[PDB]
Amino acid sequence: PYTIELIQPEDGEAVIAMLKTFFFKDDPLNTFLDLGECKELEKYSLKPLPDNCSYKAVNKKGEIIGVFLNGLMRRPSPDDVPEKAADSCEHPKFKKILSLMDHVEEQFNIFDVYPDEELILDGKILSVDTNYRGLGIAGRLTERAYEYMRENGINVYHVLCSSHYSARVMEKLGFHEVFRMQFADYKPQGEVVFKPAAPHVGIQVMAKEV
């Protein structure tokens, strides 16, 4: 028995405490790198909260057992000056993750897929407590966002997945692949950076039109 609720500003510390226990340790990229203490990822996770479309799953004791942090994403302006997120990151391990994100964006622009859309919902951080996995919480978190999308005329939900394992969860929820890149093919300076276990494969960007 759990609720799905909007994450409030006062929830920031509790959200971070939960992510530090789970996501920071068990997202496949974070585990591969042994991310450790990472204030940059705390900052990254807190950023979308004021967009008022991030959700927490909360158990009967009032503990956060899952989150899906989402932010609105806008089509680059005609006069856009594109920036690399990695350039302002001092944490060397998190810089590798941000560099991977920058690389994906250099190769693939979600706004090219949907030329008529100005605003898209971006699913940024998805994490469920281990003891509550396999119960459909990820799906219930995701589907709460559809409510927000309906209320605001947003058609597209975009979610970059860090493993085929989580891309499959999104597929079950009605998302489809829009871009993929194998870890074995990600060689920004000529050499492989990420080498997690074979079943992870690589990143897949997933999208749903609601």
Ligand X SMILES: CC(C)(COP(=O)(O)OP(=O)(O)OC[C@H]1O[C@@H](n2cnc3c(N)ncnc32)[C@H](O)[C@@H]1OP(=O)(O)O)[C@@H](O)C(=O)NCCC(=O)NCCS
Query: Is residue 136 within the footprint of ligand X (CB under 6 A)?
Result: yes
Is residue 113 part of an annotated ligand binding site? no
Minimal distance, residue 163 CB to ligand X, in Å:
6
Binds 97, which of ligand 7DP, ligand X, none (CB < 5 to 8 A, cut-off by type)? ligand 7DP
Number of residues that bind ligand 7DP (CB under 6 A): 11
Query: Is residue 55 within the footprint of ligand X (CB under 6 A)?
Result: no
**Binding track over 16-35 against ligand 7DP, x by CB under 6 A:** -----------x-xx-----
List the structure tokens of 68: 């899906």
Query: Is residue 156 within the footprint of ligand 7DP (CB under 6 A)?
Result: no
For ligand X, which stretch binds (CB under 6 A), given 2-10, 92-100, 164-172, 191-199? 164-172
**Binding track over 85-114 against ligand X, x by CB under 6 A:** ------------------------------
Which chain residues interact with ligand 7DP by CB under 6 A? Answer: 27, 29-30, 41, 97, 123, 125-126, 159-160, 162
